[PDB]
Design a protein around this ligand. Structure first.
Ligand SMILES: O=c1[nH]c(=O)c2nn[nH]c2[nH]1
Ligand SMILES: O=c1[nH]c(=O)c2nn[nH]c2[nH]1
Ligand SMILES: O=c1[nH]c(=O)c2nn[nH]c2[nH]1
Ligand SMILES: O=c1[nH]c(=O)c2nn[nH]c2[nH]1
Ligand SMILES: [Cl-]
Ligand SMILES: [Cl-]
Ligand SMILES: [Cl-]
Ligand SMILES: [Cl-]
Ligand SMILES: [K+]
Ligand SMILES: [K+]
Lengths: 303, 303, 303, 303
C-alpha cells in the first residue's frame, strides 16, 4: 500500500446553489436543500507509482504538500457550481487529477456537517430564519468516491457510495428477540417486548454513478429521505431482531428508489437494561444504560 | 469538604405524566411535553458530620453504598408522579433526607437525555410516531437542587437552578466585532460582518422555588422556550460582540418570564476562520475550523 | 457574575530553565525536571466593573480581545525565566494586570501537557534521548492562580492551588468493602477482596504562596512526588473503602510536606465487575467493565 | 456482506502465564511480560450462509446471541493457558468454530488495555509493586485473526496481523520538510528545522502464523520492541518527511525481525505551529496547536 493525504479538511460554504427538483416520496417531506450554509469534512488520499522515492529516498520533488491539498479542497468548494456533496467530490477528484499528472488514484470521503433551521419572530410572526442555524451533532450525510487515471489517460470513477451516518433510534415497544440458541454460554433471557435502541449507518450505491451528482435532481436520493424511510419502517414493523429490521429497511429503500443498486447497513445494539418492570396505575417502566459491550450487524440488500 | 455520591446515574422512564398547560410566548409554540420517553442523567452528592469516621477510621456503619443511591434514584423515577426534572429532583431529595436521618445535605444535578420525534406513514399519511424516537446529542435541559436538614429538623431548599446546555448557534451575517483595544498584543483584524458561532449554556433561577416544579405549569419556564428566545434574539440583533448578544438574550428572557429572578450565561466563541472572501457571481464565502483556543464569556442578568 | 476570557490556550516551550534543587521524600525518586520540552494548556478569565458596558451597550472600547489574551500568554511563555507552571501563572497574572489597569481581577488555570522519555541507540549504547519525546495522555500536573488589583493599585494573589489530575490506579487485591448499610435499597454484596480501581484528582494548598513558585525549589511540592505517595499508600494499605484510602493518602502528604496547609481529593470508583471467581490451577480471576454509574468522594485533609 | 457480532468486550484477567524467553534486539530492553494484570478489548464478528434467514425471515434458530459471544470470550480468557493476545484470539476462534458448526467464518480483533508499574515503600526500600498498577491511555498492542471452516470441517487461519496503536512521538529538532511542490496551491513555507510530531500505528505480519502465538517465544515480535525501534530510528534520523521516516522505521523492523513478511504504517502529522522563533539567551522556541486538518501517510515495507 502506498498513499498519503489530508484528513479533517473542514470547509463551510455559504450560498451554495440550492438543491431543488428532488422527487418526493410519501415517507418524507424532503424536496431539496436551501444551502444557505453548507458544511463538509473532507478526507483526501492520493497514490501513484511515481510517489515511491518520496518514501524510499526522502525525495520531495513530486510531493504535493498535504497542506496544499487542504488549500485545493477549500478553493474548490468556493468555485463549485453544483448542489451535492457527491458532485463536489467528483469536481475535486477530476480537478486534482487534471492538475497533477503523476497522481494515478484519488479517494475522497465527504461527511456533511449538518445545521438545522431555527425560528425568529418579526412584528408578531414566527418564521424560519434565513440567518441563524443550529449545529447538529446527530445524523449526517456521507459520500465516497474513488477515481483513477487509466493508461490511455482517461479518468474513471471506480467506486462511488453515498450514506447516512449517526442515526440513533429507539422504539419503545413492538420489538422482540426470542428463539435464539440457548446453550452453556447463554444467559440472555428471551424478550417479547424490548425498547430496541439501534445505531444505524446506511450506505447506498446507484446503478448509474451520474445520478449521485444531482445534475438531474429527480434521480438523486437524499440522505434525509433515507432517514425517514428508516423511521417509518421501524415504526411499522413488529421487529424480531435488528437483523430482521435492517433487511426490511433495505427492501423499502430499494422499492422507493429503483435507481439504486444496493443498500448496506452497519447497525449497533444499544438497548437499555430494565430496572423496574411494573409501575402502579401506569404502562411505564424504568431502564438504565447497559455495560459497554454492544452487538452489531452488517448486511447488504441488492436491487 | 466532605461528601460522596454517585454520578452518571442514567434512568429512562416511559409514560411519565405529561407536562401540559405551559403558558406560551411569541418566541415559542412550546406548550408541553408528551413524556412517552423521559430520560435523565442524575448526579447525587450527600454530606453530614456523621460521615466523618467513614473517612478517618474506615468505619462503614453509616455508609449508604453509592450503588444503593443509584438504586434509590432509579426506583424513585418509577414512583415519581410529577412532570419535570426539577420536580423529580425535589422528590428524590426530600425522600432521601426522610429516609436517612444521618444525612444533613443533598445536592442533585439532573441533565435531560433528549429525544426527538420521527415520522412514520399510516395509510399514506405521514405523521409523528408515538413509538420511534431519535436520540439527540444536541442541546438539553438541566436542573440543580441543594437541600439541607436544619437543626429543628425542617428540610430547606438552599439553592435551585434550571438550565439549557449545549446550544450551538451560528449566524451567517449581521454580526460585527470592532473597536476593541489595539496594542502590542493585538493581531485580530476588525470585522464588520462575521459568521458568529456561539455555544450557549443558559441557567435561570426562579423568584419562588415552587414554580420550578411544574405543579402549576403556567409558572413553569421550559428550556425549549429559552432555546427559542435565544434563536429569535440572535436573528433580530445586529450583534456587536458575544457580550452584547448574551445581555440582550437575558433581557428578553426576563421580560417574557417575570417569575424569574436571574439568568446566567456561559458562552463560547467558535467562529470559523475565513479562507475565501469573494466568490465570482455569488454572495458566498468559504470558512474553516480555527485553531483550538476559544473565547468565553460569563454574565448574570437580574430581574 | 461578569467575566470573559480564553480557554485551550496551548503553548509548548523548548528549553525552559530546569527545575533542580528539590527536597526528596522516601516515596519518590523525583529529583527535578529537565524541561527540554514544557507544554501547558492555559485558561484565562478576567473581570472588572469597567467591563460592564461591553455587555450592556456593546461598547468594545475597554475590551482586550480574547485573541489578544492568547497572544499575551504565548509571548509570556517565551520570556518566562522560571521553572514551574505555578510561577508561570504568577508571571502572566502580574504582567497582565500591569498592562491593563482597568482589569480588576484575573484567574488562571494551567494544565501540564506531559511528555515521557524515550530511548535510542547511538555510539554503541541505548540511552535516554534528548530529542524524541512521547506525548502522554495519563496523569498531569495542574496549577490555579487568582490575582486582584486593589483600590490603591497594588496587586494581591487571592487564591493559589496546585494539583495532579487524571491518576488512574487499580490494586488487584488487598481491598475490602464490607459493613455498609443493608436495607431496601441495597443490592451490592459485601466484598472482602475486590480489585479497587480509583481515579484520583489531588489538589494541594501551601501555607506560603511563595513556596509554589520554585524560586527556592527546596520548598516546592511536585506533582510527581504526590503521585508516588498515592501509589505507595495504596499498596501499603489494606483498604476498607475509597474514603478510608484517600484520608490515609492525605495524611501521608501532609506529613511529608509540612509546608502544605491542606490537600483536597476528588476520587471516583471504576472497579470492575467479577465474571469468573475461580480458575483451575491458578490464583487468577476474570473481570469486566461495569455499567456507567460511578461512585465519587470529595474530601479535604488539613494540617 | 452478512455478518454480526459483539464489540467492546472488555476482559481483565489476573495472573496469566508470563511471557519470557523472548529474543532481544539492540533497540529494546524488553525481556517479557509479568502478566500479573492482563486486559483486552475484543471485537468478534461471525458469518456464514446459514445465517441468511435471520435477516430475511426473522428466524433466530441459528442465531448465537451476541450476549452469548461476550460470555464465550470472557469464559475463554479464564481458561486460556497461553501468553499472548494473538494466542488468545486463536484459542477463542478455534473454540468458537468447534462449538458452532453452522458458522463459516470468525474474525477477531484484540486490543491490549495497558497498565504500567508503580512503586511503593515497604520493609525499608522503594520497589516495584506487585499489586498496584496505573492504567495507561497511551500506546497499546493489537492483534487480528480471521478463521474459516472449510467444507471438510477443517479449520484454517485466513488472516493474522499484530500491531502497535496510539504511539505519539515528537522530535524537537533534526527534521526538515523542504523541496516539495510550490505552486498556486502552496502556502506552506519550507522548514529546515521543525519539531515533527507524528502519530504512528504500526502493523506487522509474520511469515509463519505460528510465530505470533508465543508457543516458541523466541520467534515472537513484541509491540514493545517495535515501539523502541520507532523511537530509536526517529532519534537517529535527520528526517526529510514523515514518508522518509516511516520507510526507515520499516526497514529497521524487517532487519531486526527476519521472521516478518511485512510491516504496514499509518502515520499522521500533528506538528505544532511556531509562535516565537527566537528567545533571548536561549535555544528555545514557543509553539502552539495547529488547525484541525492533519496529514497522513500509509505505506507497506516488505522483506
Ligand atoms: O436483535 C438482536 N440481534 C442479535 O443478534 C442479538 N443478540 N443478542 N441480542 C440481540 N438482538
Ligand atoms: O464577541 C467577541 N468578544 C470578544 O471578547 C472577542 N475577543 N476576540 N473576539 C471576540 N469576539
Ligand atoms: O469504596 C467505596 N465507597 C463507597 O462509598 C461505596 N459504595 N459502593 N461501593 C463503594 N466503595
Ligand atoms: O512530512 C511531511 N509530509 C508531507 O507530505 C507533508 N505535507 N505537508 N507537510 C508535510 N510533511
Ligand atoms: Cl445485538
Ligand atoms: Cl471571544
Ligand atoms: Cl463508590
Ligand atoms: Cl503531512
Ligand atoms: K527518595
Ligand atoms: K537490548
Amino acid at each position: 500500500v502506498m498513499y498519503y493525504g489530508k484528513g479533517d479538511v473542514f470547509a463551510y460554504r455559504t450560498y451554495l446553489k440550492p438543491l431543488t427538483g428532488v422527487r418526493t416520496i410519501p415517507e418524507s417531506p424532503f424536496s431539496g436543500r436551501d444551502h444557505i450554509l453548507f458544511g463538509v469534512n473532507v478526507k483526501i488520499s492520493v497514490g501513484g507509482t511515481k510517489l515511491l522515492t518520496s518514501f524510499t529516498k526522502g525525495d520531495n520533488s513530486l510531493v504535493v504538500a498535504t497542506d496544499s491539498m487542504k488549500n485545493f479542497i477549500q478553493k474548490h468548494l468556493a468555485s463549485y457550481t453544483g448542489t451535492t456533496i457527491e458532485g463536489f467530490l467528483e469536481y475535486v477528484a477530476t480537478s486534482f487529477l487534471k492538475k497533477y499528472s503523476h497522481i494515478e488514484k484519488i479517494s475522497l470521503i465527504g461527511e456533511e456537517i449538518p445545521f438545522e433551521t431555527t425560528f425568529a419572530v418579526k412584528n408578531g410572526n414566527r418564521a424560519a430564519s434565513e440567518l441563524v442555524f443550529k449545529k447538529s451533532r446527530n445524523e449526517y450525510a456521507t459520500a465516497y468516491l474513488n477515481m483513477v487515471r487509466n493508461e490511455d489517460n482517461t479518468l474513471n470513477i471506480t467506486e462511488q457510495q453515498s450514506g447516512l451516518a449517526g442515526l440513533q433510534l429507539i422504539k419503545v415497544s413492538g420489538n422482540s428477540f426470542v428463539g435464539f440458541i440457548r446453550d452453556e454460554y447463554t444467559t440472555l433471557p428471551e424478550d417479547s417486548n424490548r425498547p430496541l435502541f439501534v445505531y444505524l449507518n446506511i450506505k447506498w450505491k446507484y446503478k448509474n454513478t451520474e445520478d449521485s451528482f444531482g445534475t438531474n435532481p429527480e434521480n438523486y436520493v437524499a440522505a434525509e429521505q433515507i432517514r425517514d424511510i428508516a423511521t417509518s419502517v421501524f415504526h411499522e414493523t413488529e421487529t424480531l431482531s435488528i437483523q430482521h429490521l435492517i433487511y426490511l429497511i433495505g427492501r423499502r429503500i430499494l422499492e422507493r428508489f429503483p435507481q439504486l443498486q444496493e443498500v448496506y447497513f452497519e447497525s449497533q445494539n444499544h438497548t437499555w437494561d430494565k430496572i423496574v418492570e411494573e409501575i402502579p396505575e401506569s404502562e411505564g417502566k424504568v431502564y438504565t444504560e447497559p455495560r459497554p459491550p454492544y452487538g452489531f450487524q452488517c448486511f447488504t440488500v441488492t436491487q
